[PDB]
Amino acid sequence: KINNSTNEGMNVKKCCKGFCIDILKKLSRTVKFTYDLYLVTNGKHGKKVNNVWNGMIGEVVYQRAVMAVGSLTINEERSEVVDFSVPFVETGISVMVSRSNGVDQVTGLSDKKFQRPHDYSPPFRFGTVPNGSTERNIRNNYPYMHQYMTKFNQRGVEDALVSLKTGKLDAFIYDAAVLNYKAGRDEGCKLVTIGSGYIFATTGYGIALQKGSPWKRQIDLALLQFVGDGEMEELETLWLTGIC
Amino acid sequence: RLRNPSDKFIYATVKQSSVDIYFRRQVELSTMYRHMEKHNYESAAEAIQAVRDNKLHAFIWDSAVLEFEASQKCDLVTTGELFFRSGFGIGMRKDSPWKQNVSLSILKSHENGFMEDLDKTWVRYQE
Amino acid sequence: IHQEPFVYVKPTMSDGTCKEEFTVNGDPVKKVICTGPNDTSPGSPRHTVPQCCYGFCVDLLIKLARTMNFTYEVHLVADGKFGTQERVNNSNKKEWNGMMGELLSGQADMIVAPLTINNERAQYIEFSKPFKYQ
């Protein structure tokens, strides 16, 4: 869109890459289909706002699109509206803390710190991405945590990353694979990951299809074969970097 | 040394295993397939006892199972590398109404802490 | 199949009874009455007795039965193999065995075991979302 007074906009054409885009290219190599890639202008992944979705869920349920190769979370309410293929990467959720500076720390979601910040002498702070997928998990499991997280909210992923480095934030909660890569290339490595998806969701990443898509059998055959021959392993080497 | 084994490093797995199929798919790992075929055991317990008697030297097996075994017995030692990151599933019949709600139940259990209690019962437990 | 950390098999104490042992955390051990061969075919010609099975998979299945209303009848695989597609020695007729053989034959309705998710077996049967990562 050009201005905020009018809704008119321009279809600016750009170039896309990354790790998931590697998957889509290899899928067309085997299934031999065609695509017209584009980006969502509505907003984030999906949020049912008074029985009205948005983003990718709003583009597959309303069938304005077909699939979504972008990273997406697997839960109940999203499995009701569409169907997922097989997952390919083992990703949970985790909490990020700058344990490295200059032991038990947060044992996990069951840590006494998540009972009351006043229980410990220093009042800490920890939030998530607003209107995000993981925010639903907090509300469904611990509504009190959402009330505490209400005053600890932030705006940007790197904004929280800046806050952790600067000291404007104590802890932060986000996905595992995303936060693992940002910690594999960070200089200084002050921020430290917690655990290995041990007390957490331990779910996967999937492709949202329209309900009952006949492609479902063909797509899953390739994905299992892709992890069944070591090709998935190399792509992890290309886009993941684990030092130490 | 495993790529070109000998009579010293005794490594095998359970006969007619998905690990054997996984090696067979690897067209570049036919040597280990031809080596382990002469020492495949009936069950994993045979491998456990034979290596306990220091008759074996390596044994491909699952991660959490051997973690629990090393928890039970201190002499049991594993390697460092972690490969073939997959999952275990529920063997089912063909398409049937016993598929939708089953997978939904599995998801609803994974999202909450019931799996944590199961871990406390059997997997998380140590000695 | 008999999984070392997931499925614990115990013979009955006196006659068709399972000793109601407890854990160290005040949680009663929940077992199931299972029928299966005693030893292998060369070892046991025919010895199948009702035994007591429990562990991790048993807890999972009991949770499933608690969730949705349906009964069950547990038995054991006659041998100790997951299942391979082996053609007849002379006839060269491909055939499955083990858990897959007992499920394809119609004698089994649902395999609940530490199954290895792979394309070859997914080509013949369906899976639910994985409960395990290793």
- Are the C-beta atoms of A96 and A193 separated by less than 8 Å? yes
Breaks (C-N over 2.5 A) in chain A follow: 102
On whether any CB of chain B is under 8 Å from the CB of A163, the answer is no
Residues 1-60 of A with CB under 8 A from B: none
Q: E strands, B21-97, where? A: 58-59, 88-92
- How was this one solved? cryo-EM
For residue C29, count CB atoms less than 10 angstroms from its CB and return exposed for 0-12, middle for 13-18, buried for 19 or more.
Answer: middle
Give how far B49 is from chain C: nearest CA, Å. Answer: 13
Q: Residue C81: what residue type?
A: K
To the nearest 10 degrees (0 to 180), the angle between helices A20-31 and A215-227 is 120
Q: A74 contacts in B (CB within 8 Å)?
A: 107
**Whole-angstrom distance, CA of residue C113 vs CA of residue B87:** 12
- Are the C-beta atoms of C118 and B22 separated by less than 8 Å? yes
Q: Residue C131: what residue type?
A: F
Residue with tokens 């201005």: A3
Whole-Å CA distances, C124 to A7, B58, B93, C128: 52, 32, 9, 14
On whether any CB of chain B is under 8 Å from the CB of A201, the answer is yes
Do the chains contact at C109 and B42, CB–CB below 8 Å? no
On whether any CB of chain B is under 8 Å from the CB of C126, the answer is yes
Q: Is the dihedral of CA B106, A48, A155, A185 positive or negative?
A: positive
Structure tokens at C117: 């998710």
On whether any CB of chain B is under 8 Å from the CB of A157, the answer is no
Give how far B36 is from chain C: nearest CA, Å. Answer: 16
For residue B90, count CB atoms less than 10 angstroms from its CB and return exposed for 0-12, middle for 13-18, buried for 19 or more.
Answer: buried
Whole-Å CA distances, A26 to A31, A210, C119: 9, 21, 18
For residue A52, count CB atoms less than 10 angstroms from its CB and return exposed for 0-12, middle for 13-18, buried for 19 or more.
Answer: exposed
**Residue B43 labelled as part of a binding site:** no
On whether any CB of chain B is under 8 Å from the CB of C101, the answer is no
Question: Chain C residue closest to A91 (CA)?
Answer: C133
Give how far C31 is from chain B: nearest CA, Å. Answer: 14
Residue B122: which of C24, C115, C111, C20 has the closest Cα?
A: C24
The data reach a resolution, in angstroms, of 6.1
Do the chains contact at C119 and A221, CB–CB below 8 Å? yes
Do the chains contact at C118 and A197, CB–CB below 8 Å? no
**Whole-angstrom distance, CA of residue A127 vs CA of residue A172:** 5
